[PDB]
Design a protein around this ligand. Sequence first.
Ligand SMILES: CCCN(C)S(=O)(=O)c1cc(-c2n[nH]c(=O)n2-c2ccccc2F)c(O)cc1O
Ligand SMILES: CCCN(C)S(=O)(=O)c1cc(-c2n[nH]c(=O)n2-c2ccccc2F)c(O)cc1O
Lengths: 209, 209
Amino acid sequence: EVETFAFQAEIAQLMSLIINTFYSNKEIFLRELISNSSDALDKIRYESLTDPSKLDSGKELHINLIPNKQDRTLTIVDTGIGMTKADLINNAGTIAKSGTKAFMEALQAGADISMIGQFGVGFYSAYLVAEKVTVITKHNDDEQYAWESSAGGSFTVRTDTGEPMGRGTKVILHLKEDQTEYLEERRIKEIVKKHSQFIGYPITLFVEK
Amino acid sequence: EVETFAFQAEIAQLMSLIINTFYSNKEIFLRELISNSSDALDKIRYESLTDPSKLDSGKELHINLIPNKQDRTLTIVDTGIGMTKADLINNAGTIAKSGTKAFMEALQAGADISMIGQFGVGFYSAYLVAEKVTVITKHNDDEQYAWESSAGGSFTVRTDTGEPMGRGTKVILHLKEDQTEYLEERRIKEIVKKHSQFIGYPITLFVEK
Ligand SMILES: CCCN(C)S(=O)(=O)c1cc(-c2n[nH]c(=O)n2-c2ccccc2F)c(O)cc1O
Ligand SMILES: CCCN(C)S(=O)(=O)c1cc(-c2n[nH]c(=O)n2-c2ccccc2F)c(O)cc1O
């Protein structure tokens, strides 16, 4: 059973701006997703202090970067707190609305796209490099869900029938044809070293066979 | 009834470094506390989506900057989620430990003190300008508490007997003798405009009588 939702107009407007604006510094999407993974890892780690059973779904706190040249996908995996079904829908809600409006106002006032994270809408920078984003997530208090959007004003949410992940979030970036540099080991390493050098969790870049 | 706690050694070491290192760019403490206020405001705002009764303790989501030249205090007030007694004690816990160690390692490797926030220990930059920090906080699920530390390896936690605050956190920076520039309106405005221009909550600088 697949549910389709409309993005609110300001978010749909933001997504179309990110897709259609000429902006060469596209590498910033990686920093934004890694930052969000690190925030989700902080959340589970903090909850696990007062309640250690929160880690029964997995004690390992890490980030994996998995490029796949055959599928043309860059997957970002984390074992953070994950997202509930309500969380997925709310990522296109009120906080995202005020943040989107403030960011687009800042862009009009001369700010640049790399400042997206300061408005809490950093996720949408995935659309600088991806024609489609698939998010697989599992929170301790809910089932495993698959969120997906190719922009165009909508996203879908379905219960995931795939392999269980224990806990966390998997971001599958279905890369645009001209954005395959983000599948190269040396390029990924360069971006991680430049923007995410101080992340408090092991970031593992997977090698392809 | 006042409870006294020891900071763990790495945090006590960090605090002594912040107090004794020659570092002229002290203004960064304001950005760190405002950033933490904004994060606490995001948390209550997000919780209020699925549960509107979370805002019965106050619907207003803001940050107030209150300098007081007579008391030599700069107070930062927010109506964020606030902190429980467990939260106050855990601010000197495991997450703070790994973050402190990583930050001090980065400093050895040539990083500078302004990067403190990337390690989640941004609060401790208050000790660049304050000889003592008093924190008054109220979370919906707990009583009102007063946290206090003049560094020296310890902090205290007591139930606050003062005026109720509804919900949020009040940071009272008892400024060092040579740090009174942070009580001047034009100086505060300059720092807010430079470092916190994109905060998603109204920041009000109070004028003195
Ligand atoms: C529908 C899009 C979801 N994303 C891919 S995301 O928001 O970039 C993103 C979200 C999470 C996430 N899991 N749990 C959680 O609380 N978060 C979270 C963290 C920071 C900010 C907002 C958030 F919800 C993550 O681990 C990685 C991500 O790349
Ligand atoms: C003992 C020191 C407490 N501080 C003064 S603080 O951490 O800088 C600080 C904390 C809060 C706070 N309230 N609720 C909450 O979750 N937080 C929080 C936000 C971000 C990071 C860690 C945190 F706990 C705040 O609103 C303002 C602050 O200046």
